[PDB]
């Protein structure tokens, strides 16, 4: 109990600092080509609002814990993970498009394909929820959930990446981190939840800090 709590406190700490940074980021002036970065950052802040609600719920609920509350995380992830996938698409498009591009152009052109990505991701989460609540066995959950995780990342890769190291870094770092949520599913209650608490720092908050630094680097002459 103490270690789930302490890791949640660490995760909260990084959330609060990150959110402050992200807010200032929204007001940094941007050149035409960089506007999509602010579009990304406001979606990451929305993700933060949801995440924070779950973590306050968690630390309160952990005071008197009798039930395995792990499943409640899925009510967060079903809202946050599609947003994160959209923002990943937008960042790849930003990195890889020669001309400036904004989210409206991407959404209007690709909404069907984006729905397929989010649908695959939804099936991954549904299978995990069934496993986490013990409606299917662990082995089926890991093979079915991993199948959909792969499919989601394959769809991402083949439409949105280019073959270069700045793509490989963004793509594989994320793919590995998301795969580690499946790895955590294997473990007993306390270890599993400690691993989700820290993984959320990496999968959400580090991404926001990354975007902030990209913004500050692109725009620092407009600031100074």
Ligand X SMILES: CCCCCCCCCCCCCCCCCCCC
Interacting residues with ligand RET (CB under 6 A): 77, 80-81, 84, 124-125, 127-128, 141-142, 145-146, 149, 178-179, 181-182, 185, 200, 203-204
- CA 24 to CA 32: how far, in whole Å? 19
Binds 212: which of ligand X, ligand RET, ligand 97N, none (CB < 5-8 Å by kind): none
Of the candidates 132, 152, 131, 151, the one whose C-alpha atom is nearest the C-alpha of residue 141 is 131
| Residue 123 in the binding site for ligand X (CB under 6 A) | yes
CA atoms within 13 A on the CB side of 181: 26
Tell me how crowded residue 55 is: count the other CB atoms within 10 A of its CB.
18
CB of 156 to ligand X, least distance (A): 12
| CA distance to 125, 212, 217, per residue, from 193 (Å) | 16, 28, 35
Binds 178: which of Na ion, ligand X, ligand RET, none (CB < 5-8 Å by kind): ligand RET
| CA distance to 132, 146, 183, 191, per residue, from 187 (Å) | 11, 16, 8, 6
Q: Which of 4, 8, 12, 28 binds ligand OLC (CB under 6 A)?
A: 28
Q: Which of 10, 50, 70, 146 binds Na ion (CB under 5 A)?
A: 70
Binds 170: which of ligand X, ligand 97N, Na ion, none (CB < 5-8 Å by kind): ligand 97N
């Amino acid at each position: 109990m103490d270690n789930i709590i302490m890791t949640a406190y660490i995760s909260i700490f990084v959330q609060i600092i990150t959110a402050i940074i992200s807010v200032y980021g929204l007001f940094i002036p941007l050149n035409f080509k960089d506007i999509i970065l602010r579009e990304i950052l406001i979606l990451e802040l929305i993700v933060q609002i949801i995440e924070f609600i779950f973590y306050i719920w968690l630390i309160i609920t952990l005071q008197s814990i009798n039930e395995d509350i792990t499943y409640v995380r899925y009510f967060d992830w079903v809202l946050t993970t599609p947003v994160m996938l959209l923002t990943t698409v937008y960042f790849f498009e930003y990195m890889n498009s020669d001309d400036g591009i904004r989210k409206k152009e991407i959404n209007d052109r690709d909404y069907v394909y984006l729905f397929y990505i989010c649908l695959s991701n939804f099936f991954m989460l549904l299978i995990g929820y069934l496993g986490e609540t013990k409606q299917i066995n662990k082995m089926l959950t890991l093979f079915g959930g991993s199948f959909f995780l792969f499919l989601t990342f394959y769809l991402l890769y083949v439409k949105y990446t280019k073959e270069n190291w700045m793509n490989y870094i963004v793509f594989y770092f994320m793919f590995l981190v998301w795969f580690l949520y499946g790895f955590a599913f294997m473990f007993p209650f306390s270890i599993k939840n400690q691993m989700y608490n820290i993984l959320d720092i990496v999968s959400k908050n580090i991404y926001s800090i990354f975007i902030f630094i990209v913004i500050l680097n692109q725009s620092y002459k407009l600031l100074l």
